[PDB]
Design a protein around this ligand. Structure first.
Ligand SMILES: *[C@@H]1O[C@H](CO)[C@@H](O[C@@H]2O[C@H](CO)[C@@H](O[C@@H]3O[C@H](CO)[C@@H](O)[C@H](O)[C@@H]3O)[C@H](O)[C@H]2NC(C)=O)[C@H](O)[C@H]1NC(C)=O
Ligand SMILES: *[C@@H]1O[C@H](CO[C@@H]2O[C@@H](C)[C@@H](O)[C@@H](O)[C@@H]2O)[C@@H](O[C@@H]2O[C@H](CO)[C@@H](O)[C@H](O)[C@H]2NC(C)=O)[C@H](O)[C@H]1NC(C)=O
Ligand SMILES: *[C@@H]1O[C@H](CO[C@@H]2O[C@@H](C)[C@@H](O)[C@@H](O)[C@@H]2O)[C@@H](O[C@@H]2O[C@H](CO)[C@@H](O)[C@H](O)[C@H]2NC(C)=O)[C@H](O)[C@H]1NC(C)=O
Ligand SMILES: *[C@@H]1O[C@H](CO)[C@@H](O[C@@H]2O[C@H](CO)[C@@H](O)[C@H](O)[C@H]2NC(C)=O)[C@H](O)[C@H]1NC(C)=O
Ligand SMILES: *[C@@H]1O[C@H](CO)[C@@H](O[C@@H]2O[C@H](CO)[C@@H](O)[C@H](O)[C@H]2NC(C)=O)[C@H](O)[C@H]1NC(C)=O
Ligand SMILES: OC[C@@]1(CCC2CCCCC2)NC[C@H](O)[C@@H](O)[C@@H]1O
Ligand SMILES: [Cl-]
Ligand SMILES: [Cl-]
Ligand SMILES: [Cl-]
Length: 845
């Protein structure tokens, strides 16, 4: 009864410090660890629920679950309903709910890849992969708890390899050594072990052999997820229901895709959103802000988007501008547009409530329309943020959405900003709960407090029992940032009539359908640089591919060498912004020594060259639920060596980036999956040429002015000529980079539209082209050709891995005007005059 192997003990006192006597009185086993592992744990006989009246339907199954013995938590729900829905061959879905009470729920050969079976007593759901018989879910392993404010469901895991459960600063692969992962959106500088800005209750689990599955728990309550070495996992939520989805893959990429079929495919950003953004707190005037642009331009540094932080505001209030430094804010932004750039600025959620009545429209209308989160007496809950006393909009209230749209649209008529930087949307509060504290009820003081920093649900936020239109804050807290992202997205669509650009701090599952994300107040340090790679990858797995960290870091002072290395790696973040704190030394690219400016300019130049490629990868995310930046294991799951790699990334299938992440290094050791990898340095953009890998670690030269980038054999990459903006670069001629397999083959693609309109795919207003290398030929294949894309000029074709100097190079049957062959590098560089949207044939021999 108490003979349970150590790694398999499930905690019977998750709620408090317990003595042996109390442990044994709960009906549990007490065995001290010899050195965490729980001392108090459930014997296999501990009372759970019993399955009864299991029944079949066309959709799947239903059953009643009955608990006859209470747990140690209050308000056990003794009778539950089980519903199992076999929704697709790839997707299994089950819920457990109270049949007598509607509980809070988040507002969201032919055969399945899975089979399901049930344990009767104690109750459990067992899900096998049909193909190899492997056990993916087994909830029999621990008791089911289902109490008003405490849900626990556990499972065995099929391996020690699991990723997901944002937002935390951790390796891509989570530790299963008694790790407690807390999902409660919290304003805090990224650090290991803490609940951070967002919550994504989703994991992907690898299985021996390289298949994988995913599990989503659709639950927005504060929760702990506890992983143990057996290996196993327990969800512990503080409310709601169990709403579980299992995605059968079998490939890691399909798991991600199947997960996004439920939560939403990522939104398609405007092309301009993919250029360089530059911001700091401290650009304290329009004159200083104009100087940033001027300084970048004179030093030939590309810049698509200038930003402002709090600086622009009048006394730190949304939807105003001060009349000292920012008197001519409208003219600055118009000027920006005149030069072919965009403008972004910070918006906070909380609205100043202390102004004289009649003098501040956002609050005054807010009041009239009842848009704000309210307290016990029905009055606005007042906290403290930048402007002082503030009320907090309820983005679940339809009237609040309408009010948000008005404020954005009215401010947009004054200053034509191109998107919104939504910060502080945990929501963050400078004080605990409210100016008036919080009441004493079960929501503020719950029977189980997850492991949140501050040890309370109110720390750095508003009262848990405060009222919103759809429910209490207790239930909705983890959706705050999400709901604001939805509101802002809609607001920007209505105000501007083109694709919105929303960058949000706080997020939830499903966020990437509406907005992007930056990882928050990271320190300017080597460790945070290194940590940003797993974090960027994680968000990509979670369907938020528009993500990055503050290039060169946010807090403290960057160094020149750190900024060089941060810029090199950061140019490979899908969302690329250098942002800096109030107190920090300047870190704009132009503020450094000449050799460092050169390395930084080179990294920006390579990013801009690759923008057509990066844009196509976002197209694949948007229509097929693909990742943009992806870990090696997503692309080479069968090579088990890739499983723990999180300090390299891929862009899509073909581009392997291997950064230096340490001070004083002039080399880097990177893993190279089986195949040939061409050094991108061999492609002309306005040391071994090829790595021939068996699946091995390779040491690469990486002096300060270099980041290592290789192109997988078998792939063709579209590139475009230079510009300091995408307005410029989009008008330039294009080039292909063709990486031949040894057998002379390669494939690639280009998606092209106008860069910003809505409904492009639905209206068919794009061009899609495929490129094929075969038998010493390169042709294009025209999937779709329209006015947008038809006049793209192809001026250059570079072929990697051509073994012998050719005697003739033809374009459409005519000797080209010039080519080079380099016998050292195996590169054939061809000048051409062709159109992306008209069929061509380039041959050599
Ligand atoms: C719900 O929220 C409202 C604000 O919307 C809270 O109203 C606040 O209540 C306190 C008293 O409990 C007021 O404090 C008093 O201020 C006056 C005049 O300035 C002072 O002379 C008194 O001695 C006292 O400090 C406070 O002014 C008022 N806030 C506002 C903005 O009017 C209300 O208390 C909240 N209800 C609960 C139960 O939290
Ligand atoms: C398990 O189900 C039995 C039988 O319920 C009937 O069949 C079902 C498919 C559904 O149509 C029910 O509404 C039917 O009542 C339940 O046993 C019955 O208990 C009821 C009410 O307490 C009583 O009228 C009958 O005498 C019982 N019938 C028999 C044949 O035993 C039972 O409660 C269900 N178990 C649980 C825990 O829900
Ligand atoms: C980040 O740097 C500032 C300034 O550091 C000084 O000036 C630089 C150009 C560089 O040469 C440094 O080595 C200098 O020492 C720090 O802010 C300073 O704080 C100290 C007290 O701690 C104060 O006496 C200085 O005058 C401040 N300087 C100014 C002008 O703001 C700051 O502490 C650094 N941040 C961290 C976290 O280390
Ligand atoms: C699901 O997990 C349960 C509990 O860990 C496993 O059930 C135990 O299995 C062994 C061998 O069958 C027995 O000695 C115990 O009696 C079982 N426990 C219970 C409570 O029945 C079970 O093997 C797992 N199922 C699968 C398919 O792996
Ligand atoms: C933009 O660049 C200009 C030129 O480098 C900067 O202005 C100089 O700043 C230094 C401070 O280190 C002063 O000694 C000089 O008075 C300024 N020189 C000139 C040419 O006027 C300016 O600080 C930069 N602005 C921004 C916003 O980066
Ligand atoms: O708007 C101001 C800031 C920073 C404020 C905060 C001040 C004290 C120390 C930490 C930074 N909001 C929080 C955001 O994360 C940050 O980017 C933004 O610059
Ligand atoms: Cl004791
Ligand atoms: Cl509710
Ligand atoms: Cl290895």
């Amino acid at each position: 009864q108490c003979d349970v192997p150590p790694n398999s003990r499930f905690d019977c006192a998750p709620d408090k410090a317990i003595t042996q006597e109390q442990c044994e009185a709960r009906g549990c086993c007490y065995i001290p660890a010899k050195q965490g592992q729980p001392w108090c744990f459930f014997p296999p006989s501990y009372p759970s629920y019993k399955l009864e009246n299991l029944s079949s339907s066309e959709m799947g199954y239903t059953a009643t679950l009955t608990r006859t013995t209470p747990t140690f938590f209050p308000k056990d729900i003794l009778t539950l309903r089980l519903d199992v829905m076999m929704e697709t061959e790839n997707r299994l879905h089950f819920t457990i709910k109270d049949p007598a009470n509607r509980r809070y729920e988040v507002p969201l050969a032919p055969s399945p890849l899975y089979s399901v079976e049930f344990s009767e007593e104690p109750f459990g759901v067992i899900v096998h992969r049909q193909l190899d018989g492997r056990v993916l879910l087994n909830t029999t392993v621990a008791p089911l708890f289902f109490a008003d404010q405490f849900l626990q469901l556990s499972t065995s895991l099929p391996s020690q390899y699991i990723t997901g459960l944002a937002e935390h600063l951790s390796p891509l692969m989570l530790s299963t050594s008694w790790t407690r992962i807390t999902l409660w959106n919290r304003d805090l500088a990224p650090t290991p072990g803490a609940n951070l800005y967002g919550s994504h209750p989703f994991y992907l689990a690898l299985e021996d052999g390289g298949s994988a599955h995913g599990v989503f728990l659709l639950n927005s309550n504060a929760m702990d997820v506890v992983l143990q070495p057996s290996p196993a996992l327990s969800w512990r939520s503080t409310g709601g229901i169990l709403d579980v989805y299992i995605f059968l893959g079998p490939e890691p990429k399909s798991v991600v895709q199947q997960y996004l079929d439920v939560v939403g495919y990522p939104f398609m950003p405007p092309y301009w959103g993919l250029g360089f953004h530059l911001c700091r707190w401290g650009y304290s005037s329009t004159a200083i802000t104009r100087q940033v642009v001027e300084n970048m331009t004179r030093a030939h540094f590309p810049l698509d988007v200038q930003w402002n932080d709090l600086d622009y505001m009048d006394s730190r209030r949304d939807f105003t501008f001060n009349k000292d430094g920012f008197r001519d804010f409208p003219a600055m932004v118009q000027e920006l547009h005149q030069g072919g750039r965009r403008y972004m600025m910070i918006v906070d959620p909380a609205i100043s409530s202390s102004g004289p009545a009649g003098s501040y429209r956002p609050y005054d209308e807010g009041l009239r329309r009842g848009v704000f989160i309210t307290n016990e007496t029905g009055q606005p809950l007042i906290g403290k943020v930048w402007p002082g006393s503030t009320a907090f909009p309820d983005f679940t209230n339809p009237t609040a959405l309408a009010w948000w749209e008005d404020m954005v649209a009215e401010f947009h008529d004054q200053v034509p900003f191109d998107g919104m930087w939504i910060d502080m949307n945990e929501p963050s509060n400078f004080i605990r709960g409210s100016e008036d504290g919080c009441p004493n009820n079960e929501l503020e003081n719950p029977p189980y407090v997850p492991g949140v920093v501050g040890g309370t649900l109110q720390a750095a936020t508003i009262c848990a029992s405060s009222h919103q239109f759809l429910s209490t804050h207790y239930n909705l807290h983890n959706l705050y940032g999400l709901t604001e992202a939805i509101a802002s997205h809609r607001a920007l669509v209505k105000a501007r009539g083109t694709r919105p650009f929303v960058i949000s701090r706080s997020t939830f599952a499903g966020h990437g359908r509406y907005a992007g994300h930056w990882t928050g107040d990271v320190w300017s340090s080597w460790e945070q640089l290194a940590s940003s790679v797993p974090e960027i990858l994680q968000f990509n797995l979670l369907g938020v591919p528009l993500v990055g960290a503050d290039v060169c870091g946010f807090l403290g002072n960057t160094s020149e060498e750190l900024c060089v290395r941060w810029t090199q790696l950061g140019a490979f973040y899908p969302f690329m912004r250098n942002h800096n704190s109030l107190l920090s030394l300047p870190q704009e690219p132009y503020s450094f020594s000449e050799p460092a400016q050169q390395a930084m300019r080179k990294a920006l130049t390579l990013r801009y060259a690759l923008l057509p490629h990066l844009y196509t990868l976002f197209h694949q995310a948007h229509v097929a639920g693909e990742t943009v930046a992806r870990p090696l294991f997503l692309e080479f799951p069968k090579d088990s060596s890739t499983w723990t790699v999180d300090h390299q990334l891929l862009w899509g299938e073909a581009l392997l980036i291997t950064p230096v992440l340490q001070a004083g290094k002039a080399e880097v050791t990177g893993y190279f999956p089986l195949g040939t990898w061409y050094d991108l340095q061999t492609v002309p953009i306005e040391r071994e040429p090829a790595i021939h890998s068996e699946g091995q670690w390779v040491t690469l030269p990486a002096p300060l002015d270099t980041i290592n980038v290789h192109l997988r054999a078998g792939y063709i990459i579209p590139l475009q000529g230079p510009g300091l903006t995408t307005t410029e670069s989009r008008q330039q001629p294009m080039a292909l980079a063709v990486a031949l397999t040894k057998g002379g083959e390669a494939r690639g693609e280009l998606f092209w539209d106008d860069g910003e309109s809505l409904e492009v795919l639905e209206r068919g207003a794009y061009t899609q082209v495929i490129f094929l290398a075969r038998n010493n030929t390169i042709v294009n294949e025209l999937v779709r050709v329209t006015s947008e894309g038809a006049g793209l000029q192809l001026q250059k074709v570079t072929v990697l891995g051509v073994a012998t100097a050719p005697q003739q190079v033809l374009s459409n049957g005519v000797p080209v005007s010039n080519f080079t062959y380099s016998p050292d590098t195996k590169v054939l560089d061809i000048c051409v005059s062709l159109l992306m949207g008209e069929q061509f044939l380039v041959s050599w021999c």
